[PDB]
Design a protein around this ligand. Structure first.
Ligand SMILES: CN1c2ccccc2[C@]23C[C@H]4[C@H]([C@@H]5CC(O)N4[C@@H](C5)[C@H]12)[C@H]3O
Ligand SMILES: COc1ccc(C(=O)O)cc1
Length: 121
């Protein structure tokens, strides 16, 4: 659920999901079209796609459990949907951390009309 995800992001990067990653570029947030503006936005695109492989799961509200094993995120056993949601979120958090160096405030509150082009998962 968004609760586990925003907490995962905060622990990883130091930034809060909202508003550092809720209205970023073309894919971080409500976003769902265009060409990712940068690496961080590409993390959200892939995260999007990852949730995309789980049509019968509800990523926003289904809660999962996870623990830190010396920094490393370890998804704990839950239902099938919860395990996969967690893997999707774990990947995005790490991707976010790996690209913190290029995070640009230029792509914050990014206009919808500048999300141009197309990309398939
Ligand atoms: C295509 N679409 C879907 C088609 C059928 C069921 C569920 C989904 C989505 C909505 C949502 C989310 C991610 C992130 C995203 O932008 N959306 C994608 C993948 C999915 C995922 O949940
Ligand atoms: C990062 O926080 C959120 C909250 C709600 C939604 C949504 O409702 O689609 C997406 C991200």
């Amino acid at each position: 659920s968004l609760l586990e995800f925003g907490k995962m992001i905060l622990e990883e990067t130091g930034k809060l999901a909202i508003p550092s990653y809720s209205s970023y570029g073309c894919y971080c947030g409500w976003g769902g079209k265009g060409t990712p503006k940068d690496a961080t936005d590409r993390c959200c695109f892939v995260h999007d796609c990852c949730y995309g492989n789980l049509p019968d799961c509800n990523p926003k509200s289904d809660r999962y459990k996870y623990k830190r094993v010396n920094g490393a995120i370890v998804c704990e056993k839950g239902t099938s949907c919860e395990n996969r949601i967690c893997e999707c979120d774990k990947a995005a958090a790490i991707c976010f951390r790996q690209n913190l160096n290029t995070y640009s405030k230029k792509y914050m509150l990014y206009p919808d009309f500048l999300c141009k082009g197309e990309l398939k998962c």
